[PDB]
C-alpha cells in the first residue's frame, strides 16, 4: 500500500475546534473517492468519527476511531493498510487529530535518564544535545509548535520538570492534525508518479506495570515492533527515522531499540552528529515531538506525513539528502505499545 497525498497543519495553541482542525487538514484530500475514514484520536464530544464524516460532507462514508493513546496514529495507519489489502476499502483517509487546549511519563523519563547515565557513563550533555538538535530542526519546520533554536546551556538551564530533566527536553501539550490518503500499490501511480510505499509495519505491546518492566534503558515493545517491521519490509537500512521522543532520553533509547546503535552507544551518535540533519542517519528531521509538539492522536500520522515529504524530496530546508527509505515509531505510554512503519520509494 502507498501514501499518495497528505495534509498537515501547524501544531500549537490553536484557535480552531477539533472539527475545524480536521476540515483544514483534509480540505484538499476530499477530491478523491474516499471510501473509509479512520480517525486517530485519544481524548474526544462523542461519536467523533461520524461527526467528522458529516462535517466533511462525506455523510455516508464509513468511519471509526482508533485509540492507542500516544501510539494511536501508527495503529490507525496499520488498520488503514489492512482495510486496503483485504479489499474492504480502496481509498482510505486516515486523520490524526487532538485538541488539548480546551508513575507519570515525565517521572519515568527521568528514571531512564539517571539509569542510562549510570549504566553507560553517558555525559548529561549528550541527552540535552538531543533537544539542541531537535529545536534546530523544528526551527526549519513551519508546522512545528516550537520554532526556536536553543543552546545546550539554555536547555540545561530551562526549568526542572523531573530531576535531572528540564522543560526544553520534553514535548509540549499541543493541538493539531495530520492526514494521509492510502491506496493499494496497483492504484498508486494513478494518484502520483512518486507514491511513498509502506514497506512493512510491526506492532508490539509490553507490560504496562511499571513495577514489572525489566529495566528503564530499553523499551522491549519498540525492539519487538522494529524487528517485525524490518522482517516484513525486507530491508536492513534506513535513511532517516521519526521517533517518539516524549523526552530527549527516549530518542536515544529508541534509536538503539530500533536497531541503529548498540545499547548504550546511542548517546555517542548524538555527540558525533550522526543523527543531525546533515549526518549519516538523521533522526527527527521534523524537530521530533521535542519541537513539533505532541497532539496525542495526530503525532503518529504526522510522522507518516514527514516520511512522505522526505522521500519525495519535498521537505525544503529540513530535507534529508537522498532519502529513499524511512522509519517512524508511534508509542503508547512508557513503551506499553509500539508501532514501527518503514516507508520507501519502492514497494
DSSP state of 168: G
Q: Which of 47, 123, 273, 347 lies at the binding interface for a copy of itself (CB under 8 A)? A: 47
Nearest to 8 by CA among 307, 245, 330: 307
- Residue 291 touches which member of Ca ion, a copy of itself, none, C-beta under 5-8 Å by kind: none
In the chain the first and final C-alpha atoms are separated, in Å, by 8
Q: Which of 30, 208, 235, 274 lies at the binding interface for a copy of itself (CB under 8 A)? A: 208
184 near Ca ion (CB under 5 A): yes
> Within 294-313, which residues bind a copy of itself (CB under 8 A)?
296
The DSSP bridge pattern shows strands 325-332 and 240-242 to be parallel
30 near a copy of itself (CB under 8 A): no
- Residue 306 touches which member of a copy of itself, Ca ion, none, C-beta under 5-8 Å by kind: none
Chain residue at closest Cβ approach to Ca ion? 184
Q: Which of 1, 29, 34, 332 lies at the binding interface for Ca ion (CB under 5 A)? A: 1
Q: Which of 69, 185, 192, 313 lies at the binding interface for Ca ion (CB under 5 A)? A: 185
- Residue 185 touches which member of a copy of itself, Ca ion, none, C-beta under 5-8 Å by kind: Ca ion
| Residue 341, SS3 per DSSP | strand
**CB–CB of 181/93 below 8 Å?**
yes
**CB–CB of 181/34 below 8 Å?**
yes
328 near a copy of itself (CB under 8 A): no
Q: For a copy of itself, how many residues bind (rule: CB under 8 A)?
A: 58
**CB–CB of 131/292 below 8 Å?**
no
Q: Give whichever of 185 and 205 is closer to Ca ion, judged by the CB atom.
A: 185
Give every CB contact of residue 240 below 8 A, 6+ residues apart in sequence.
281, 282, 283, 285, 307, 310, 320, 323, 326, 327
Site residues for Ca ion per CB under 5 A: 1, 184-185
Amino acid at each position: 500500500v502507498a501514501i499518495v497525498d497528505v495534509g498537515i497543519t501547524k501544531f500549537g495553541k490553536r484557535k480552531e475546534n477539533i472539527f475545524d482542525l480536521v476540515k483544514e487538514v483534509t480540505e484538499k484530500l476530499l477530491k478523491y473517492d474516499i471510501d473509509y475514514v479512520i480517525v486517530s484520536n485519544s481524548y474526544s464530544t462523542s461519536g467523533l468519527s461520524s461527526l467528522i464524516t458529516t462535517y466533511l460532507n462525506l455523510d455516508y462514508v464509513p468511519s471509526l476511531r482508533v485509540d492507542n493513546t500516544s501510539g494511536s496514529g501508527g495503529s490507525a495507519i496499520l488498520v488503514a493498510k489492512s482495510l486496503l489489502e483485504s479489499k474492504e476499502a480502496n481509498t482510505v483517509l486516515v486523520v490524526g487529530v487532538e485538541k488539548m487546549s480546551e508513575a507519570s511519563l515525565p517521572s519515568l523519563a527521568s528514571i531512564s535518564a539517571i539509569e542510562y547515565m549510570r549504566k553507560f557513563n553517558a555525559p548529561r550533555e549528550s541527552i540535552a544535545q538531543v533537544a539542541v538538535k531537535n529545536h534546530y530542526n523544528g526551527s526549519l519546520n513551519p508546522f512545528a509548535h516550537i520554532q526556536k533554536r536553543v543552546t545546550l546551556e539554555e536547555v540545561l538551564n530551562s526549568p526542572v520538570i523531573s530531576e535531572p530533566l528540564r522543560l526544553y527536553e520534553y514535548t509540549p501539550i499541543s493541538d493539531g492534525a495530520a492526514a494521509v490518503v492510502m491506496v493499494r500499490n496497483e492504484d498508486a501511480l494513478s494518484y502520483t508518479s512518486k507514491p511513498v510505499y509502506i514497506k512493512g509495519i510491526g506492532s508490539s505491546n509490553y507490560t504496562a506495570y511499571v513495577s514489572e518492566k525489566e529495566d528503564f534503558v530499553t523499551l522491549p515493545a519498540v525492539v519487538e515492533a522494529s524487528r517485525k517491521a524490518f522482517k516484513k519490509a525486507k530491508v536492513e537500512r534506513i535513511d532517516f527515522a521519526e521517533l517518539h521522543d516524549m523526552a530527549t532520553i527516549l530518542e536515544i533509547i529508541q534509536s538503539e531499540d530500533i536497531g541503529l546503535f548498540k545499547k548504550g552507544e546511542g548517546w555517542k551518535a548524538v555527540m558525533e552528529g550522526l543523527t543531525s540533519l546533515d549526518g549519516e542517519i538523521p533522526i527527527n528531521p521534523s524537530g521530533g515531538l521535542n519541537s513539533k509538539g505532541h497532539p496525542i492522536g495526530a503525532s503518529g500520522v504526522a510522522q507518516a506525513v514527514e516520511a512522505f515529504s522526505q522521500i519525495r524530496n519535498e521537505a525544503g530546508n529540513r530535507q534529508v539528502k537522498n532519502a529513499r527509505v524511512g522509519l517512524s515509531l508511534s508509542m503508547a505510554g512508557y513503551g506499553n505499545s509500539a508501532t514501527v512503519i518503514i516507508y520507501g520509494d519502492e514497494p
